Amino acid sequence: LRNDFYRQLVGKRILIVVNYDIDAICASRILQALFKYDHMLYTVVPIMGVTGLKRAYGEHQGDVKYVVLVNCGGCVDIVELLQPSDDVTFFICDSHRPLDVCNIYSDRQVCILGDASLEENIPAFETIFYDSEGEDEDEDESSDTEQQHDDSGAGESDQEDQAPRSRKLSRLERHEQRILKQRARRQWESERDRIMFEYTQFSYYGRSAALMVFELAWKLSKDNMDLLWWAIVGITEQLLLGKIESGAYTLELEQIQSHVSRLTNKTNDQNTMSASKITFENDLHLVLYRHWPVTESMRYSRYSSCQLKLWTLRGEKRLHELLLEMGLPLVHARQTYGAMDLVLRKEFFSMVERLAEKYDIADIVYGTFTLSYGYRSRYAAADYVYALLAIMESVKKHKTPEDCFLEASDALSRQHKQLLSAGIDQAKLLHAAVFRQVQSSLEARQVHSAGSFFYYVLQEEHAFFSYPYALGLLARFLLRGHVATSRARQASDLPLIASCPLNASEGMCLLVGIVPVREDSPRNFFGKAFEQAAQKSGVALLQDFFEPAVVQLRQSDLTRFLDSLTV
């Protein structure tokens, strides 16, 4: 809580705007407003990894006491990181769930926004940072160390019955004096059945970046309805169960309903031009449903493509034969929905909810929003994150990537929209350059069993996919095709690998991988799994990214690495 600490927020600070994300700029660009509200001058930062972290703060070495932590924290006992932390406060609103308690405890310059269903790490700092064996933090027979040292009385301290602390078992003797180590490893390790089961099994994330910030500012008599749309960007970034597990998807159908079915600054005069009060609507999260013809969707939909095999023609025979039950035209089924005749686009959605009942794809419809600025338009709630990431363009001019991070922050203004359609120049063509090796894949059958998973690697770059995140998508695009449709469950469901050719960046074998179908809540051991081969051997490995699921090799230090990675 900071209803009290926000009262403190006057003196100098840094609002770093945390590592690569949608949600950051959503949950920060709000705050360039609030700072000019309370008359605060500011400074904000691009982060791509721990590289950026001190390479810049080493340039900003003050004692600036009010400091942020979002999308970060699972990196260092960050006093170990920022040793110039003496009393310089940090601020926690991070979504990275698995973090170390060393930054929770020693709670000098950190603030716990803590409420959760995990009472499993209670003394984990009281032993882990407290114990050791073959330990020197003790007295000795020598007359030099017969003084009050940091007598931790622990697995740090003596094993000759000179130690105040360690009331856990007997100190005179259990069966001998030296059984202290035995119980120390027992107590150390027997919980590492759970502790090292934490942080060495998988990784996943928490919650929002500005939902609290809405509620923080909800008290401030602030009906900045615009900011709600800024908010939902971060919501449907990863509340979407199509990407990341929410559950609260179906339980904030109450809350934000309880927000905005409640919150109505105009019950009487809301039907006019600028930013009419919003709606919730039961809609899709379909592949860019609105602005281009159906025949873009009916191919480019994974939820169609998962169940129907549409890269080939039987899908299309299945397609149109299901358009029998609608009896849609075809010319109209190849122009933009918004451009079609009108009773069709109007009437269209109403029947699809019901006459998708029988054709294996019933779960295309979800809950969403929709609103505008004026009368040029009706932008769409879900139709916004995807044009953004066309500006996350992996140009190697050395100027674009940092600077285009700034353009994003200039993007979500009402004033700045000419740029915005440029994404749509870029986005769709990506989305159908998607197939550009897929049907070359499913028929080449470039899926590799590779033991206890499924496995793929690409060996030729895309200027598109130099940029990293689509690597996950293509991985998420195909195993449905052959691996999930021509098989039984025993021979189908296993996770996958997805390599990234850096045909330009000197050769370093970038990669991501993902779980099998219908195993989502089974969080990915890939949170650690790639440490398997690396922990054993490791060869020039990197974890320079903030992300867990992310790596970087050499051109040729991947196969024997992968051979170690068999397990």
Binding site: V10, M40, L41, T43, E59, V64
Partner: protein, 94 residues
């Protein structure tokens, strides 16, 4: 603060001495080289860093560690430093 990135210097020094008249009455009876072209900022806390838009010439002689005056001329630079320029490639940001 920032002369040209590259007997005119004698005329510039004469113009600088001629501008003194303005400076004398400006700011007070006694005189202040008066801020006319920067910090419509309400002044906030004095020690936070900078950002630019590819400035060039590199004349920032103002009280900082090292700024390297272009975009990301950014170091722990106080208020005394950052009093230089506005629209020569700088003020996307503070």
């Amino acid at each position: 603060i920032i002369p040209g990135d590259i007997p005119e210097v004698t005329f510039f020094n004469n113009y600088s001495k001629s501008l003194a008249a303005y400076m004398c009455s400006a700011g007070y009876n006694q005189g202040l080289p008066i801020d006319l072209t920067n910090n419509l900022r309400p002044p906030k806390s004095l020690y936070i860093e900078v950002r630019c838009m590819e400035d060039y010439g590199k004349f920032e002689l103002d009280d900082g560690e090292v700024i390297h005056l272009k975009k990301n001329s950014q170091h722990y630079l106080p208020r005394a430093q950052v009093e230089s320029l506005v629209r020569q490639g700088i003020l996307h940001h503070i």
